[PDB]
Amino acid sequence: SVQIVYKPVDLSKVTSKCGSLGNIHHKPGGGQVEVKSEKLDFKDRVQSKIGSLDNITHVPGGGNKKIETHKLTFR
Amino acid sequence: SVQIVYKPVDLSKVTSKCGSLGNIHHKPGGGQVEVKSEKLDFKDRVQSKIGSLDNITHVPGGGNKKIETHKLTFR
Amino acid sequence: SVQIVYKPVDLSKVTSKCGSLGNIHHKPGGGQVEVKSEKLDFKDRVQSKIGSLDNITHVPGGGNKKIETHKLTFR
Amino acid sequence: QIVYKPVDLSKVTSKCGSLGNIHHKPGGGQVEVKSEKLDFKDRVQSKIGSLDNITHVPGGGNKKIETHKLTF
Amino acid sequence: QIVYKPVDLSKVTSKCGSLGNIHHKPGGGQVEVKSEKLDFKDRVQSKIGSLDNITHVPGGGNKKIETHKLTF
Amino acid sequence: QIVYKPVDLSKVTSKCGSLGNIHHKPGGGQVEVKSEKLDFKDRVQSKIGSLDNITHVPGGGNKKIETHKLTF
Amino acid sequence: SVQIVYKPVDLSKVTSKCGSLGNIHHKPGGGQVEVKSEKLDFKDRVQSKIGSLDNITHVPGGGNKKIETHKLTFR
Amino acid sequence: SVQIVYKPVDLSKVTSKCGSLGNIHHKPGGGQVEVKSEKLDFKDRVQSKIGSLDNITHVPGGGNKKIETHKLTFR
Amino acid sequence: SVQIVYKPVDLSKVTSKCGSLGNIHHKPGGGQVEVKSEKLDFKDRVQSKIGSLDNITHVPGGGNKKIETHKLTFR
């Protein structure tokens, strides 16, 4: 006889208040990227990024995150 | 006989208050990146980034984070 | 006979108050990066970054973080 | 009486063998200008806020400048 | 009486073997200018806020400047 | 009486073997200028806030400057 | 003024005598050759042999050789 | 004045006598050759052999050789 | 004046006599050759052999050699 009672209670909160949001300037000055290689050989779960000039402007009004994971493994 | 009572209570809070948010200037001056290699050979869970000029502006009104993990493993 | 009673109570708070947030200037002066190699050979859980000139401006109104992990392992 | 009679048999010359590829690859750029009340007079050369790139490969950039003059 | 007669048999010369590839690859840049009330007069050369790049490869950059002059 | 007769048989010369690749690769840069009330007069050369790069590879940078002059 | 009298005499003999020539066997085992390469980039006077498997049985009745090089040169 | 009288006399003999030549066996075991490379980059007067497996049975009745080099040179 | 009288006389004999030549066996075991490389980068007069497996049975009835070099040189 085995008994398991997985009952994690959670009344938590993630909250923000901001009065105003703006006057944000993202003015990148270009640039030069050169990448040289011979063969590219990628196998089994490869994440790759080569030769990038990426610009990201991200202004969420409330970028709040609640991330939660629950896992029961009987065997 | 075995008994398990997994009941972690959580009434916590992650919170922020900000008066105003702005007058943020991100003006990068370019640059030069050169990468040279022979073969690229990546296998089994590889994360890679080569030859990058990335500019990120991130101004969340409230970048608050609750990250939580629960794990019960009977065996 | 075996009994386990996992009941960690949590009433904690992570909080911030800010008057105003701004007048932030990120003006990087470019630069020169040269990377030279022969073969790149990455295997089994490799995180890599080569030849980078990355600029990050991060101004959260409240960059508060609550990180918690719970783990019970009966065997 | 005046007898202005200069003589010039002079040579300005060059030899060059060969040159490779000529690649000009600008990387972009940012220029911002807020000019006001600019008064310029008589032979003014001016640049305000410039991000200029020049590749200049003449096979023989040889110059010969002469300024003869007489006045009375 | 005046007899202005300079004589010039002079050589300005160069020999060069060869040159390789000529690559000019600028990396971008930032220029910001807030000019006001600029009064420029008579033969003024000016640059304000410059991020300029020059590659200059003449096969023979030979120069010869002469400024002959007479006055009465 | 005046007899202005300089004579010039002079050589300005160079020999050069060979040269390699010419790579000019600027790394970007930041320029900020806040000029005000600038009064410039007569033959002024000026630079304010400059991030300038020059590659200058003449096969023969030979110069010859002469300034002949007579007055009465 | 200047004279050259190149008269190299040659009466040399290269000879062989054999009674009989035979009962020769070439029965080598079956060979294997694997070659793996990526890009091949051969330029200017390259001589190349890759992945060869040669079986040779050379039985001349008189494999005699006589090689002579004459090279007079005047400047 | 100059005089050159290049007259090397040659009466030399290279000779052989054999009674019989035979009962020769070439039975080597089966060989294996593996070569692995990435890029090959051969430039200017390269002589290259890769991955060879050569079996040779050379039974000349008279493998005699006579190699001679004459090289008069005047400047 | 200059006089040169290059007259090397040559009456030399290279000779051989054999009764019989045979009952020769070449039975080596099967050989294995593994070569592993990355990039090959050969420039200017490279002579290269990689991954070879050579079996040779050379039974000349008279493997006699006579090599001679004559080289008069004037300036």
- B27 CB within 8 Å of a chain D CB: yes
Of D50, I2, D70, the C-alpha closest to E47 is D50
Between CA I75 and CA F55 the distance in angstroms is: 48
The pair of three-digit structure tokens given for residue B60, joined into one six-digit string: 């969340």
DSSP classification of residue G36: E
Cβ-Cβ contacts under 8 Å for I28 (sequence gap 6 or more): H28, H29, I55
Q: Which residues of D touch F60 (CB under 8 A)?
A: 14
Of B26, B16, A31, the C-alpha closest to C58 is B26
Over its C-alpha atoms, chain A yields an Rg (Å, rounded) of 23
The pair of three-digit structure tokens given for residue I39, joined into one six-digit string: 């990039």
Between CA C25 and CA D31 the distance in angstroms is: 17
The helix/strand/coil state of D63 is strand
Between CA F49 and CA B47 the distance in angstroms is: 42
Between CA D54 and CA D67 the distance in angstroms is: 29
Please, what sign has the CA dihedral across residues E20, E21, E27, E31?
Answer: positive
Between CA I6 and CA I25 the distance in angstroms is: 49
CB-CB neighbours of A63 under 10 Å? 20
- Do the beta carbons of residue F58 and residue E6 sit within 8 Å? no
Of H29, F70, B52, C32, the C-alpha closest to D69 is F70
Q: How many residues does the structure list for chain A? A: 75
Place of tokens 């296998």: B43
The helix/strand/coil state of C14 is strand
The pair of three-digit structure tokens given for residue E44, joined into one six-digit string: 């003024």
Q: Which residues of C touch F27 (CB under 8 A)?
A: 30-32
Between CA E66 and CA F13 the distance in angstroms is: 18
Of B42, A45, F24, the C-alpha closest to D56 is F24
Cα→Cα distances I72→E43, G11, H66, I9, Å: 77, 21, 20, 15
- Do the beta carbons of residue B9 and residue C9 sit within 8 Å? yes
- Do the beta carbons of residue H37 and residue H50 sit within 8 Å? yes
- Do the beta carbons of residue A2 and residue B5 sit within 8 Å? no
Sheet holding C32-36, edge to edge: A32-36, B32-36, C32-36
Between CA E45 and CA F44 the distance in angstroms is: 6
Of F63, F23, D62, the C-alpha closest to E59 is D62
CB-CB neighbours of C60 under 10 Å? 24
- I22 CB within 8 Å of a chain G CB: yes
Between CA A7 and CA A45 the distance in angstroms is: 35
> Which method resolved this structure?
cryo-EM
Chains that touch F (3 or more CB pairs under 8 A): A, B, C, D, E
Task: Find how far residue F70's CA is from the centre of its chain.
Answer: 27
DSSP classification of residue E2: B
Between CA G65 and CA I67 the distance in angstroms is: 12
- Do the beta carbons of residue B62 and residue B16 sit within 8 Å? yes
Of F28, F38, F57, C27, the C-alpha closest to E47 is F38
Task: Find how far residue G16's CA is from the centre of its chain.
Answer: 19
Cβ-Cβ contacts under 8 Å for B51 (sequence gap 6 or more): A33, A34, A35, A50, A51, A52, B33, B34, B35, C50, C51
Q: What is the dihedral of CA B36, B42, B46, B50, to 10 degrees?
A: 10
CB-CB neighbours of B29 under 10 Å? 29
Which of F13, F31, F39, F45 should be substituted to probe chain D, the one whose Cβ sees the most D Cβ atoms within 10 Å?
F31
Picking from I6, I11, I34, the nearest residue to H6 by CB comes out as: I6
CB-CB neighbours of F67 under 10 Å? 10
Of B53, E49, B37, E48, the C-alpha closest to D27 is B53
Place of tokens 């300036």: I75
Interchain CB distance below 8 Å, A30 and F25: no
Specify burial of residue D21 (Cβ count, 10 A radius: 0-12, 13-18, 19+): exposed
Between CA C68 and CA B70 the distance in angstroms is: 9
Interchain CB distance below 8 Å, H37 and I34: no
- Do the beta carbons of residue G22 and residue H46 sit within 8 Å? no
Interchain CB distance below 8 Å, C43 and B46: yes
Tell me the resolution in Å: 2.5
Ramachandran angles phi, psi of C66, nearest 5°: -115, 115
Between CA A47 and CA A40 the distance in angstroms is: 13
